[PDB]
């Protein structure tokens, strides 16, 4: 018989920039010049687009598993490490970078001079390929490739100072996928090569800021076990290389295994289609232009083609 409590406040074809974007995204080495000019999203600000290509000659040691990482770190091509045959990297493994040309002219020579020329960045494409060099009489082994969703986050832990405090540092989450072969992978003989690409792992494209002062992961005076990482990433001296940021792209993992008595040689190439944000006091401002306008059909075709492609193909179809 109780009275109810009253309630209130009850309530077409593609465009030329789109085709160029698709070409820079999926088919780098099939054209005389890089066609990509910009990402045809909503943003139409002032950007500077740079394309980085590396041509490296690498020999693989016999009886070792060589792991190669293609991470979305601007200014760096790949990270490399080697472990005994038949095994996987352990807590004693350390990765080292191989720089793109002209790193100093863009990111300075000091760990606190990374933002002198640019302010932010965003990726559009990422590719890799291996072309064998050895003849058909001395090679042996295989090549396996798979992707991992590696991202950058933070970890907190207490420190026993006087008085005690708490610490917040950077750490990488998702690196545990390197310790085993993924169910979705491409495996074949060494002599046939490989060619794979990555794609955006976000519903849309966003700008990432430039990180400063990072030269190792985990950083100095921090133990590896505190962060929880599987292995260690190093970048050497600040005058040569460093870590600038982490983009929204999937990490490519490539493992090359060779038994005893094998002689494996090849050439490793990398491609990048990346936009920047220049500073008016820098010399890079003169080459800038405006991002292309929106294109819905291009984005839908991008998503469909990204889904449809296989994990990797042999070098003959690069």
């Amino acid at each position: 018989q109780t009275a109810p409590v009253p309630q209130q406040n009850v309530p077409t074809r593609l465009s030329q920039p789109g085709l160029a974007f698709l070409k820079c995204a999926f088919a780098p080495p099939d054209f005389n010049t890089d066609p990509g000019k910009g990402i045809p999203d909503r943003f139409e600000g002032k950007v500077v687009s740079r394309k980085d290509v590396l041509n490296q000659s690498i020999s693989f040691t016999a009886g070792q598993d060589t792991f190669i990482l293609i991470a979305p770190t601007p200014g760096v091509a790949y990270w490399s490490a080697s472990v005994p045959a038949g095994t996987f990297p352990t807590s004693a493994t350390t990765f080292n970078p191989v720089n793109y040309p002209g790193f100093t002219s863009m990111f300075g020579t000091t760990s606190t001079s990374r933002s002198d020329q640019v302010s932010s960045f965003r990726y559009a494409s990422m590719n890799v390929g291996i072309y064998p060099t050895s003849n058909l009489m001395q090679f042996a082994g295989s090549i396996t490739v798979w992707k991992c969703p590696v991202k950058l986050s933070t970890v907190q832990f207490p420190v026993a100072t006087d008085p005690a405090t708490s610490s917040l540092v950077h750490t990488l989450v998702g690196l545990d996928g390197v310790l085993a072969v993924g169910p979705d992978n491409f495996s074949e003989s060494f002599i046939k090569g490989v060619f794979s690409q990555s794609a955006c792992n976000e519903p849309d494209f966003e700008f990432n800021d430039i990180l400063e002062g990072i030269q190792t992961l985990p950083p100095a005076n921090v133990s590896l076990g505190s962060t929880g990482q599987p292995f260690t990433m190093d970048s050497g001296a600040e005058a040569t290389s460093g870590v600038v940021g982490w983009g929204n792209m999937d990490t490519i993992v490539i493992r090359v295994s060779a038994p005893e008595g094998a002689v494996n040689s090849a050439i490793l190439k990398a491609w990048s289609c990346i936009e920047y944000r220049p500073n008016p006091n820098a010399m890079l401002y003169q080459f800038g232009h405006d991002s292309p306008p929106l294109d819905e059909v291009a984005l839908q075709e991008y998503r469909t083609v990204a889904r449809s492609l296989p994990v990797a193909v042999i070098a003959a179809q690069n």
Binding site: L22, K23, F26, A27, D30, E301, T304, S308, A316, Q317
Partner: peptide
């Protein structure tokens, strides 16, 4: 044989 592979997907769709 990569550009025409991408062309096939768009034509099919």
């Amino acid at each position: 044989s990569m550009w025409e592979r991408v062309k096939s997907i768009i034509k099919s769709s």
